[PDB]
Design a protein around this ligand. Structure first.
Ligand SMILES: Nc1ncnc2c1ncn2[C@@H]1O[C@H](COP(=O)(O)OP(=O)(O)OP(=O)(O)O)[C@@H](O)[C@H]1O
Ligand SMILES: [Mg+2]
Length: 376
């Protein structure tokens, strides 16, 4: 009777898998898997076989770590080729009907059916509110008696069919079933406080190839997008600036990386190899932070451009930065120097996943739980 929730994040840098348990009104992580791969680029499958093997290896790792024979999983989908919009649907009753999870599922399904865009598929439909018998608004209609109808006013996330199909295919080629998919646009709602989600908060996830942006207000997702600029570009800038290899630039980024120049130490020194020579050059943390700060600043300017385009300039709920690149020192200080609102770095609380790169994978689990609770 043991119930586990397994999520998979097919990242450009690494595939991440989490095995979760419902505990103390939250999630207990009993196992994780992580595999760095080259099969994924810009959040999409670049080499099917390599990606497939990476996913398989990650599922194996999580299975060994948790002691669970993983057969069914929940898959996150990146905010790429994605559209967010509002839609309503209503189902009719011709006799007094006690509402249950099946009616909710039906009325939500109708919204999936309403989409007639051939290239895209609706992946998530989440209720904003319910209306019983055209007049009575409710948060949760279950166990209420409807005499005429049940309407839902919902948020909808649709994605390019090619992405959905390919990701699911790649995962299911590893001997597991994909139970459901969850867009990160929906997922990131879980890392926010009720206050943040109410006032108007912006989530910025800086990964390797992709930076994702999602805005929430009045307790619901408003809109989302992604930018093709993240950690890899920071590394590129380091490699170019220090005239070193990409590999060395990556290691240097982890070891001495700092995103705020004024706070970076010129007394903290390190040595680096050269590409066009056999000689070695010494650099300081401040020298490095010059390039790192320039790139991260550019990323945040891209984020501001997205917010301006979406008409979401007012961010009273503040900024919440996550993802692997949020591991960099000085990120919070830089963004705080760029905005008048509150800024924080989100890191999952559970032991084993206290790294910001896991934010998506854990959130996915929450998402699934939420729907489980909704369709009761
Ligand atoms: N301690 C650290 N300091 C600086 N950067 C780091 C650190 N740890 C990881 N990173 C960077 O984070 C990035 C990977 O983050 P993450 O795992 O969130 O990306 P992903 O989800 O695999 O890729 P994407 O979301 O872009 O498809 C890499 O660019 C890596 O260099
Ligand atoms: Mg990611």
């Amino acid at each position: 009777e043991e119930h586990y929730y397994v999520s998979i994040d097919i990242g450009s840098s690494s595939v991440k898998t989490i095995v979760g348990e419902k505990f103390h009104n939250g999630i207990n992580v009993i196992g994780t898997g992580q595999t760095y791969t080259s099969g994924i680029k810009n959040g999409l499958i670049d080499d099917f076989d390599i990606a497939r093997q990476a996913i398989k290896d990650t599922i194996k790792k999580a299975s060994i770590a948790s002691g669970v024979d993983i057969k069914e999983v929940f898959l996150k989908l990146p905010i790429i080729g994605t559209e967010v919009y509002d839609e309503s649907n209503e189902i009719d009753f011709y006799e007094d009907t006690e509402i249950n999870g099946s009616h909710i599922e039906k009325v939500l399904e109708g919204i999936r059916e309403k989409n007639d865009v051939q290239e895209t598929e609706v992946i998530n439909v989440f209720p904003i509110r319910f209306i019983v018998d055209k007049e009575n608004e409710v948060s949760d209609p279950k166990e209420l008696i409807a005499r005429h109808s049940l309407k839902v006013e919902a948020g909808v996330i649709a994605i390019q069919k090619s992405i959905l199909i390919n990701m699911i295919k790649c995962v299911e080629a590893c001997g597991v079933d994909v139970l459901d998919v969850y867009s990160d646009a929906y997922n990131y709602g879980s890392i926010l406080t009720a206050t943040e989600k109410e006032l108007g908060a912006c989530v910025i996830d800086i990964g390797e190839d992709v930076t994702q942006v999602a805005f929430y207000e009045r307790g619901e997702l408003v809109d989302a997008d992604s930018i093709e600029m993240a950690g890899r570009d920071i590394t590129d800038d380091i490699a170019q600036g220090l005239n070193t290899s990409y590999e060395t630039a990556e290691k240097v980024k982890h070891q001495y990386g700092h995103a705020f120049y004024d706070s970076a130490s010129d007394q903290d020194i390190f040595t680096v190899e050269q590409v066009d020579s056999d000689e070695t050059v010494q650099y300081t943390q401040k020298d490095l932070s010059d390039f790192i700060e320039a790139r991260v600043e550019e990323i945040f300017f891209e984020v501001f451009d997205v917010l301006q385009d979406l008409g979401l300039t007012k961010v009273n709920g503040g900024f919440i930065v996550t993802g692997g690149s949020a591991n960099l020192l000085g990120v919070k200080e830089l963004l705080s120097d760029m905005v008048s609102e509150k800024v924080r770095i989100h890191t999952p609380s559970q032991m084993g996943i206290r790294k910001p790169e896991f934010s998506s994978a854990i959130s996915t689990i929450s998402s699934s739980i939420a729907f489980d609770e909704l369709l009761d």
